[PDB]
Write an enzyme that holds these catalytic residues in place. Structure first.
Site, PDB file in Angstrom:
ATOM      1  CG  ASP A 138       7.472   5.594  16.383  1.00 19.86           C
ATOM      2  OD1 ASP A 138       7.640   4.690  15.780  1.00 19.86           O
ATOM      3  OD2 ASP A 138       6.891   5.401  17.439  1.00 19.86           O
TER       4      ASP A 138
ATOM      5  CG  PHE B 122      13.735   1.757   6.237  1.00 20.45           C
ATOM      6  CD1 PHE B 122      14.100   3.002   6.160  1.00 20.45           C
ATOM      7  CD2 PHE B 122      14.200   0.715   7.191  1.00 20.45           C
ATOM      8  CE1 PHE B 122      15.008   3.249   7.212  1.00 20.45           C
ATOM      9  CE2 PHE B 122      15.303   0.998   7.877  1.00 20.45           C
ATOM     10  CZ  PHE B 122      15.637   2.395   7.966  1.00 20.45           C
ATOM     11  N   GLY B 123      11.582  -0.108   2.728  1.00 20.30           N
ATOM     12  CA  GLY B 123      11.047  -1.067   1.976  1.00 20.30           C
ATOM     13  C   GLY B 123       9.600  -0.941   1.968  1.00 20.30           C
ATOM     14  CG  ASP B 124       7.701  -2.351  -1.189  1.00 20.79           C
ATOM     15  OD1 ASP B 124       7.958  -1.412  -1.893  1.00 20.79           O
ATOM     16  OD2 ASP B 124       7.957  -3.652  -1.537  1.00 20.79           O
TER      17      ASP B 124
ATOM     18  NE  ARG C 197       7.076  13.664   0.704  1.00 18.11           N
ATOM     19  CZ  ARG C 197       7.500  14.709   0.237  1.00 18.11           C
ATOM     20  NH1 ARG C 197       6.654  15.612  -0.217  1.00 18.11           N
ATOM     21  NH2 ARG C 197       8.624  15.367   0.655  1.00 18.11           N
ATOM     22  CG  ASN C 198       6.529  11.095   4.792  1.00 19.95           C
ATOM     23  OD1 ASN C 198       5.850  10.222   4.063  1.00 19.95           O
ATOM     24  ND2 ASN C 198       7.510  11.902   4.545  1.00 19.95           N
TER      25      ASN C 198
ATOM     26  CB  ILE D 297      -1.146   0.138   1.090  1.00 19.59           C
ATOM     27  CG1 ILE D 297      -0.183  -0.108   2.481  1.00 19.59           C
ATOM     28  CG2 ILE D 297      -2.106  -0.878   0.839  1.00 19.59           C
ATOM     29  CD1 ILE D 297      -1.220   0.426   3.700  1.00 19.59           C
ATOM     30  N   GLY D 298       2.126   0.996   0.174  1.00 20.25           N
ATOM     31  CA  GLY D 298       3.019   1.999  -0.160  1.00 20.25           C
ATOM     32  C   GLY D 298       4.509   1.352   0.040  1.00 20.25           C
ATOM     33  CE  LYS D 299       5.950   0.280  -4.959  1.00 13.80           C
ATOM     34  NZ  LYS D 299       6.429  -1.194  -5.258  1.00 13.80           N
ATOM     35  N   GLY D 300       8.515   2.879   1.031  1.00 10.69           N
ATOM     36  CA  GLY D 300       9.531   4.152   1.359  1.00 10.69           C
ATOM     37  C   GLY D 300      10.914   3.332   1.058  1.00 10.69           C
TER      38      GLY D 300
ATOM     39  CG  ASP E 203      10.900  12.656   4.426  1.00  8.53           C
ATOM     40  OD1 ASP E 203      10.997  13.606   3.954  1.00  8.53           O
ATOM     41  OD2 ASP E 203      10.558  11.599   3.883  1.00  8.53           O
TER      42      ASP E 203
ATOM     43  CE  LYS F 101       9.587   1.697   6.879  1.00  9.78           C
ATOM     44  NZ  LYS F 101       9.205   1.759   5.546  1.00  9.78           N
TER      45      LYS F 101
END
Length: 246
Positions: A142, A20-22, A128-129, A15-18, A124, A36
């Site tokens: 966090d 760090f990983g999806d 969006r975040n 449902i998202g990807k940063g 950041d 995460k």
């Protein structure tokens, strides 16, 4: 108490990807959860786990659990309404009144106030975040380990970050909130952003923006980082606005 049983977690959908990983909508034995998936070393964050898992406040996405080295499966509360940026564009002026905008601003400010109090830098901060729960509460994350339009100018040159640069991003965030999620810096071009900001350029107030909210934004945009107000003082300024402006 922080370990969950992997055997009982179902990864349903990305449902998202940063970086760090999806991030995935998961199913932990009955409830919708956010997961995460880390692979690309995590070992860093995990050391700071207890201290970063010590972080609890109602405007911080709540941690539910953690699977490790099989590279983490960080399990958190699921924010049913997604990113505030998206929500502000979807819902737009038609749905979101003036009380709702100040509440989102207060929700984020309270989380910022809290992390400020624990000596934690966000690095950041941007609409969006920020996520929105099913109950309409904005929360930030966090988990932790450069976007020109959001980052204080001393943090772009220096490459180092502080609470005071989070204060600069918070004003940019307020501008996003009051403009129903317009990409920042509509009057100038991406290429010119840094060089104009560095000489004091400041965005104009979003259409229909409350004069006092515009002054909070402006105070967040001081070029002397030390002279930007704390999230403690921002919290008081926004509480002040809520109390008299309604």
């Amino acid at each position: 108490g922080w370990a969950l049983n992997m055997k009982e977690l179902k990864l349903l959908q990305t449902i998202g990807k940063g970086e760090f990983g999806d991030v995935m909508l998961g199913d932990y034995r009955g409830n919708k959860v956010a997961v995460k998936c880390i692979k690309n070393d995590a070992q860093a964050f995990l050391a700071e786990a207890s201290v970063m898992t010590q972080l609890r406040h109602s405007n911080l996405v709540q941690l539910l659990g953690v699977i490790v080295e099989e590279g983490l499966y960080i399990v958190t509360e699921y924010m049913a309404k997604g990113s505030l940026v998206d929500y502000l564009r979807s819902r737009g002026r038609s749905v979101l009144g003036g009380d709702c905008l100040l509440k989102f601003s207060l929700d984020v400010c309270e989380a910022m106030e809290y992390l400020e109090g624990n000596n934690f830098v966000h690095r950041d901060l941007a609409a969006r975040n920020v996520l929105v729960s099913e109950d309409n509460v904005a929360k930030v994350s966090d988990f932790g380990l450069l976007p020109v339009k959001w980052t204080a100018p001393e943090a772009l040159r220096e490459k180092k970050f502080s609470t005071k640069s989070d204060v600069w991003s918070f004003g940019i965030l307020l501008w996003e909130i009051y403009s129903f999620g317009r990409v920042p810096y509509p009057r100038i071009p991406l290429k010119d952003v840094v060089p104009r900001v560095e000489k004091g350029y400041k965005m104009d107030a979003p259409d229909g923006c409350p004069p006092a909210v515009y002054e909070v934004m402006k105070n967040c945009w001081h070029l002397d980082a030390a002279m930007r107000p704390s999230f403690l003082q921002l919290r008081e300024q926004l509480e002040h606005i809520k109390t008299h402006e309604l």
